[PDB]
């Protein structure tokens, strides 16, 4: 099992879009962010948002309000439909991932981004 | 005999990993007037960091490498012994909390 499969795609909330536009804007050569997924836990799987300059051949592109979100095909399966959001509040800065298929959203509140 | 007060308890205290220490120093340096961060809990519960200018009366202080971490007394019975570490995940810079009672 690999692709050529029509996905619904992924989204950025306006907040996530503004922030990505702001990191583009301080940062030259940055075209967008890229969601990958990493092995973790028992047969677990973590999200990983990264600054990107040179997209891979295989990436897909989901553009909202000028912000680019490149997602690898070998990832679409495990994360089709996720919306990427960004919450900034006082000292907390973080990119959050809402997978529609996931139910069981994290409890282990054993993290704080800044 | 047996009579006590947890405000006068001897705590194991919280620790800071060397990576958490520098990012705290880094967060503090960026803000003139800030002297450290305060670890708290909210809400099935979660850790939150707050900026500290003037520390509270009932706040305990844990120093390590010039990094000041404040913890209120009301939270000590619950997060004492906790270790604060730091990890970068893509664009996320995230403080992590290892609590011996997780």
From Swiss-Prot, chain B:
GO terms for cellular component: cytoplasm; cytosol; iron-sulfur cluster transfer complex. Keywords: 2Fe-2S, 4Fe-4S, Iron, Iron-sulfur, Metal-binding. Pfam families: Fe-S_biosyn. PROSITE patterns: HESB. Disruption phenotype: Deletion has only a mild effect on cell growth. However, deletion of both IscA and SufA results in a severe growth phenotype in minimal medium under aerobic growth conditions. Disulfide bonds: none annotated. GO terms for biological process: iron-sulfur cluster assembly; response to oxidative stress. One of its GO terms (molecular function) is 2 iron, 2 sulfur cluster binding. Homodimer. Interacts with SufB and SufC. Belongs to the HesB/IscA family. Member of gene cluster sufABCDSE that mediates iron-sulfur cluster assembly under oxidative stress and iron limitation conditions. Binds [2Fe-2S] and [4Fe-4S] clusters by mobilizing sulfur atoms provided by the SufS-SufE cysteine desulfurase system and then transfers the assembled Fe-S clusters to target proteins including ferredoxin and aconitase. Seems to act as a Fe-S cluster carrier rather than a scaffold, this role being performed by SufB and SufC. NCBIfam families: iron-sulfur cluster assembly accessory protein (TIGR00049), PRK09504.1 (NF007050), sufA_proteo (TIGR01997). PANTHER family: IRON-SULFUR CLUSTER ASSEMBLY PROTEIN, PROTEIN SUFA. This is Iron-sulfur cluster assembly protein SufA. It comes from Escherichia coli (strain K12). The lineage of its organism: Bacteria, Pseudomonadati, Pseudomonadota, Gammaproteobacteria, Enterobacterales. The gene is sufA.
